């Protein structure tokens, strides 16, 4: 069975069903299909998603953390959230939150010590809505994968100024960006930003 | 036989507009036909398919049964009257048939 | 608490009807729910205009979940027959859809109404 | 130029004037005009593609039959592509009939892009002029008084002028961004034309090739009806009930009026919801937001008067009285004798100069001439609403 | 908790920002009485907004929501359940699945 209609392959060994990676549906999948150096998603560790509406992306994150790792989805909306509920009724890694992540301490007992966080939201306070997660839940030297939508955060200003402004907003919060990407032909005027939450040795 | 009864009963509970416009057999198999009810609503009237009759009635009856699964999808408490009201629009077209 | 949420105010509704009439002249307005579900499944739907006075209400309610599923906006307008004249149609219209066409004369007013739709939701 | 010289608005008594709704044979009456010589006549057009002629000279009883002329599907365009549409009869959707102010020739028009003018006695055609355009569907007409000048409005943003005694076109006027629904004209060489959704109204000077702009703006989407009582001022009704008495002092009107005929019948909570819990059945109704205005489906003023009459599908043809300072108009009364879609209204006059004996005619239908445009219409059947007014 | 539904009852006070009966009760034993205006017995909080609801329940207590407190609770998460020394019955990770999915079905409410 497909989760949203993508085509899955199957192999045999003395059956593995691999779900293909649509890059247009997910800016994380477009970030993999654009090419990355050092990806903070891991085959064993625990990872937190922000902005997991349904399993357009977060099911693939549950795959890439596998039978070991666990994915803490963060969302708010009722109708894609219910899809995430009973789509998490088959995979054990997935657990979603229905709380607004402007106060991530409202669900602070529900996760302890996440290591990696991903950002997919459209809110204009994207640095603050990640910084209220990574100041309390993120492991030291655990990285942040931002997904910046420049027309939704601040659309009056120029193109690169949004990313160059948010990167300094991250550098105010001990979030040194390792590397940047734009992923243009998959999605027009977007970005993903790989950094590591440093907190010790920022210069 | 007891499976049939609780099947038509959970039909009459959750999707009464699907069981009044058509009946519990086609309606209960329909939510398997999309795999689930939330995949019935996102399907079109053309994209769903049921059983001069085939070209017209399997499209317009599909229209009203899709719109029945809409008000079964998003209501908290669904009614049995408006399932028959949306049945009656198929009834005028089928008396025209 | 409201299922007919979010409803649009009257001058914003008139801006919405002017967008809809301009798109019906533009032929990018794909009308009704049967074209709406196809525009949202194929990925060409820009946003939806819907009238809450229809019988019954939820025959358009595939569009709010469908619209949150694909990052597409939607609104609720109060009038159905004024929306019918907004489509240009002698019969009352409660569903219309704004699509992608690069051959647009209303390319900016589409985003002008979409901004105040997104501010509403 | 002429100003308002009559002040008989205190004399009209509505509660004692006879209200009557008569029976016709036809369906979906699209307009009523009335002709007065300076006997009485009445011309009608109906969606059987038919021009009927009735006699409203008898104020004591109902109208009586005079003659009829139905079109049909046997006057089909023989080519269906050419610039000509010179067939004598109608094939689709008459919009307007108009008898001349001398009453010698009378022209019909509609979606068929034909202005076909007919003789009055024999009920036979006298001429046909097509609009020579595909998008030029003529909707409304304006005759000039004491003359044969006819001012027509079309769907391709054209305001045409014709002399009926010469079978000729004199000029066409441009400027409407959206299409033209209604136009009124009087004894001068002037007329008012309103748009479909732009709310831009122009009081036209026909020779001089100029135009003014009247912009107004529940919230307005249309200017449905417009009447010419005098020169410097006119009136419009609107779909949001915005009844505006327009002056030449400001581009803004001299009087703004809100919802006239009441508020729209609140939709059925049974039919909107379909909810087996009643507690949600009030929740989609949205309280105050979903409630709607009535339109003004007809507006008509007797020329150079202080009284003008509004008509809607509410079932209330509400007559309003303008005061002597010409700055505001005020409710005079209501007319509930017939209900339904009121498409066109003309009042005919008789008597002395002192004592005026009237008869209002309104064209009562189930749907408009311009469209269907209706839901939960109550108490409507096709016919002619007559009113017998004395003093 | 004696159940997982009590965890639902408690997270439906946390996610609002209210104090449960037990959330009051553990501190009445664990934090015995100091003075009310000075020299207050001081607990560290990770949530600010519950702080007023805590101080309503306790008059003589200093409720601190600081970055040092955030570092202490973050480090307690870092070294996890191992600072319980046998008292953690079972594992945290099996509890997180049931708590997240049950609180999720509480909020979406279908």
Curated annotation (Swiss-Prot), chain A:
Catalytic activity line of the entry: L-glutaminyl-[histone H2A] + S-adenosyl-L-methionine = N(5)-methyl-L-glutaminyl-[histone H2A] + S-adenosyl-L-homocysteine + H(+); a ribonucleotide in rRNA + S-adenosyl-L-methionine = a 2'-O-methylribonucleotide in rRNA + S-adenosyl-L-homocysteine + H(+)
Enzyme Commission identifier(s): 2.1.1.-
Reported impact of residue 96 to S: In nop1.3; thermosensitive allele showing a decrease in histone-glutamine N-methyltransferase activity upon shift to restrictive temperature
Positions of crosslink type Glycyl lysine isopeptide (Lys-Gly) (interchain with G-Cter in ubiquitin): 27
GO BP terms in the entry: box C/D sno(s)RNA 3'-end processing; maturation of SSU-rRNA; regulation of transcription by RNA polymerase I; rRNA 2'-O-methylation; rRNA methylation; rRNA processing; snoRNA guided rRNA 2'-O-methylation
Coiled coil region boundaries: none
Post-translational modification: Methylated by HMT1, forming asymmetric dimethylarginines (DMA) within a domain referred to as an RGG box, made up of repeated Gly-Gly dipeptides interspersed with Arg and aromatic residues.
Assigned GO CC terms: 90S preribosome; box C/D methylation guide snoRNP complex; nucleolus; nucleoplasm; small-subunit processome
Subunit and partners: Component of box C/D small nucleolar ribonucleoprotein (snoRNP) particles that contain SNU13, NOP1, SIK1/NOP56 and NOP58, plus a guide RNA. Interacts with snoRNA U3. Interacts with MPP10, NOP58, SIK1 and SOF1. Component of the ribosomal small subunit (SSU) processome composed of at least 40 protein subunits and snoRNA U3.
Protein name, UniProt field: rRNA 2'-O-methyltransferase fibrillarin
Species of the source: Saccharomyces cerevisiae (strain ATCC 204508 / S288c)
UniProtKB/Swiss-Prot annotation, chain C:
Species: Saccharomyces cerevisiae (strain ATCC 204508 / S288c) (Baker's yeast)
Subcellular location(s) per record: Nucleus, Nucleolus
Protein name per UniProt: 13 kDa ribonucleoprotein-associated protein
Signal peptide: none
Top-rank lineage group of the source organism: Eukaryota
GO CC terms, sorted: box C/D methylation guide snoRNP complex; nucleolus; nucleoplasm; nucleus; precatalytic spliceosome; small-subunit processome; spliceosomal complex; U4 snRNP
PANTHER family given in the database record: RIBOSOMAL PROTEIN L7AE FAMILY MEMBER
Family statement drawn from the similarity comment of this UniProt entry: Belongs to the eukaryotic ribosomal protein eL8 family.
Swiss-Prot record, chain D:
GO biological process, one term: endonucleolytic cleavage to generate mature 5'-end of SSU-rRNA from (SSU-rRNA, 5.8S rRNA, LSU-rRNA)
Sorted UniProt keywords: Acetylation, Coiled coil, Nucleus, Phosphoprotein, Repeat, Ribonucleoprotein, Ribosome biogenesis, rRNA processing, WD repeat
Extent of the WD repeats: 89-128, 133-172, 175-214, 218-256, 292-330, 337-383
One GO CC annotation: small-subunit processome
Subcellular location(s) of the protein: Nucleus, Nucleolus
A GO molecular function held by the record: U3 snoRNA binding
Purpose of the protein: Involved in nucleolar processing of pre-18S ribosomal RNA. Required for efficient pre-rRNA cleavage at sites A0, A1 and A2, and biosynthesis of 18S rRNA.
Additional observations: Present with 5130 molecules/cell in log phase SD medium.
Record remark: domains: The WD domains are required for nucleolar localization and U3 small nucleolar RNAs binding.
Subunit structure: Interacts with UTP25. Component of the ribosomal small subunit (SSU) processome composed of at least 40 protein subunits and snoRNA U3.
Protein name stated in the entry: Ribosomal RNA-processing protein 9
